[PDB]
Design an enzyme around this catalytic site. Sequence first.
Site, mmCIF file in Angstrom:
data_model
loop_
_atom_site.group_PDB
_atom_site.id
_atom_site.type_symbol
_atom_site.label_atom_id
_atom_site.label_comp_id
_atom_site.label_asym_id
_atom_site.label_seq_id
_atom_site.Cartn_x
_atom_site.Cartn_y
_atom_site.Cartn_z
ATOM 1 N N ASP A 42 0.883 -1.162 0.000
ATOM 2 C CA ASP A 42 0.000 0.000 0.000
ATOM 3 C C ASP A 42 0.925 1.217 0.000
ATOM 4 O O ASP A 42 1.510 1.569 1.023
ATOM 5 C CB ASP A 42 -0.934 -0.018 1.206
ATOM 6 N N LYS A 53 2.776 11.462 -3.626
ATOM 7 C CA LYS A 53 1.638 10.859 -4.316
ATOM 8 C C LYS A 53 0.684 11.907 -4.888
ATOM 9 O O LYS A 53 0.030 11.651 -5.908
ATOM 10 C CB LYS A 53 0.901 9.937 -3.353
ATOM 11 N N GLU A 93 -7.148 0.789 -4.573
ATOM 12 C CA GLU A 93 -7.274 0.634 -3.124
ATOM 13 C C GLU A 93 -8.622 0.067 -2.667
ATOM 14 O O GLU A 93 -8.620 -0.878 -1.864
ATOM 15 C CB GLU A 93 -6.963 1.978 -2.451
ATOM 16 N N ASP A 145 -13.261 5.176 3.109
ATOM 17 C CA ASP A 145 -11.796 5.199 3.340
ATOM 18 C C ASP A 145 -11.387 6.580 3.847
ATOM 19 O O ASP A 145 -11.185 7.500 3.052
ATOM 20 C CB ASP A 145 -10.995 4.856 2.061
HETATM 21 K K LIG Z 1 -1.878 2.898 -2.353
HETATM 22 K K LIG Z 2 -8.129 7.763 2.102
#
Ligand SMILES: [K+]
Ligand SMILES: [K+]
Length: 536
Positions: free
Chosen positions: A7, A68, A172, A196
């Site tokens: 991840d 990111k 994800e 999330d």
């Molecule tokens: K990721």
């Molecule tokens: K998130």
Amino acid sequence: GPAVGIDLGTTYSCVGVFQHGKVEIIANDQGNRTTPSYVAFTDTERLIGDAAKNQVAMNPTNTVFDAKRLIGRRFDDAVVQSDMKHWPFMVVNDAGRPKVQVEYKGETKSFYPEEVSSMVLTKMKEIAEAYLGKTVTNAVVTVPAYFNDSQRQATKDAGTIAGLNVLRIINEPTAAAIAYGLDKKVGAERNVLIFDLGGGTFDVSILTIAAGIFEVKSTAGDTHLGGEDFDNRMVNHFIAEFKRKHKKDISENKRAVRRLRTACERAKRTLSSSTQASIEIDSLYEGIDFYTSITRARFEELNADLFRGTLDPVEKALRDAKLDKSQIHDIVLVGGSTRIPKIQKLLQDFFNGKELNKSINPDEAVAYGAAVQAAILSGDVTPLSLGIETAGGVMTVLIKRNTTIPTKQTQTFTTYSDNQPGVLIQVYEGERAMTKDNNLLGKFELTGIPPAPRGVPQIEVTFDIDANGILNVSAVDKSTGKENKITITNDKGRLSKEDIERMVQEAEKYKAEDEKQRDKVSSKNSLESYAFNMKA
Ligand SMILES: [K+]
Ligand SMILES: [K+]
Ligand SMILES: c1ccc2[nH]ncc2c1
């Protein structure tokens, strides 16, 4: 050696491996199961992860994080321009591409975002090699579902630069659903909501899962919502309480604010399991000890607008999926902030008391799922929507994908032009809005239509799929009973699972263009007499 699941997150990363029937999340050299996605450059050396985050207040201009948010983007992107304003390190433009620029061993240096992420991936790769006692070359890496092709490609490049052979880039929310075994259900299709809240972003995703195939139906969220915003509400509360009690403003003193913020993060975590937390800071400011407390209810009140705000992307996602909240089969909680009980209660109340999937550590669940998918790669329903071409080359669906077999669907069509002598029935398979982007399976003509104005003749088209999987498509002129028919074979190995996934992925990629095309269309019951795709 076994392949790992990584991840690669905005604020932290996590690596896991499926071994002896069980996923293990791998602790790093400091014993931590997650590693900050930070890189620091100093006069002596380059630090990655925990060491980098620890010294950030000492070296903020040469400590890079949030790579990111830059990966795969152009310098001119409006996201990049807004995000730059909040970062202490410099971002420069090299031939249209952003680079982070820092001082390293006395020399100015610049790095592409994927280079920075490859340093995070090298550290993850090293963490896994220490645990496994052997080299790690294969990996599954996750990205947010809304990443486009350039962001996905730039993530794979970082893996290559790090020396990983990236088996697959997976979303994800899909990783999370795999972690919970929602793909192994083997029945009618299920709608799954992935909630999330963590790593500085809030993402809501709705997926459909059937026959081992995931399709992303919709995504919504907030790219700048996370645990730091809840902590910040507590910090300002206590600054005000201190100012009220001692007539002093501690905002002047950077370290005082840092100590308070650290205390507030700790209290936030306590409030997830207790109804009150104690704040004890010696000599916070002008030699005054700050001993106090906060209740869960006060913390919820301080964050009321932020907490209730998380239901607005849920409602948005449901709208875009064209689903009612009662049609969600599975709710999955990912991200550290989902431990907050008010969040869980808001979400459960919104779903009329439905139980939430949350037993997997929400900080690790995405790595958990990637690790399972990596292990798989190391070692009856319709697969694709079915329809016919209507006027203008538009795909008009008679049987949605994931429909149980056998099944029979009929719809009534008319002619597009006056005195149309016949219609051309063209059977397509695929998920795109225009027939040119789907797969032609067969065509036949229905002629002998009596001359009539546009829209008068009535043609009934029937799609029938028997238990053997054979598709029979027929059309009948409703004024005469004259009909014509085609049979379409479905031999084993016609479509591989990869072929299906490719079609699904193209649909998710062009979802914006196609959905505006579905708004744009005017008549979806009119049939022409020619193939639109052969028209000059
Ligand atoms: K990721
Ligand atoms: K998130
Ligand atoms: C032919 C083409 C596509 C199909 N889907 N399901 C049955 C079938 C037959």
